[PDB]
Every structure is written in C-alpha cells, then in structure tokens.
Symmetry: C3
Subunit: 27 residues, 3 copies
Amino acid sequence: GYIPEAPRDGQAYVRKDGEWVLLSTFL
Amino acid sequence: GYIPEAPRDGQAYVRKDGEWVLLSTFL
Amino acid sequence: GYIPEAPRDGQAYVRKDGEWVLLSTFL
C-alpha cells in the first residue's frame, strides 16, 4: 500500500517497521 | 495524505514538514 | 505517483531514486 504523510513537526523522519521514526533517534 | 515520490536525482531524502529534504542536510 | 511501504524488517530506510535504501549506509 501507499503510506501516509509523516508528522509535520519540524523533525525529519525515516521509514521503519511500517512507521515514521525520527531521524534523530539514529544520529 | 499520500506522499509524492522524492526527486530521482541519485540523492537520499528524508521526510520533514511535508517535504523531501536531503539526508545530507542532517549528517 | 505515490510512495509505497518500505520493508518491515527492523531497519530504517530513506528514499533514493524511487526506492527505499538503508539508512545505515550513510551513518
């Protein structure tokens, strides 16, 4: 399926396990 | 909503504030 | 067109040239 927009909250997101996850978690 | 394709310019993108932003911005 | 779901495999993905690619390459 196609995935919905990531949160629009000033943060960058990456895709993991069917969810948008904060890039900062990996940095 | 659903999300348009990122640029097909050979660069990696993350999703931020309803836009595709270069991953390199944050590395 | 629209973005499809990434693999659901415990790894983080970013978008490049119409595909999902591993974030870990870049870190």
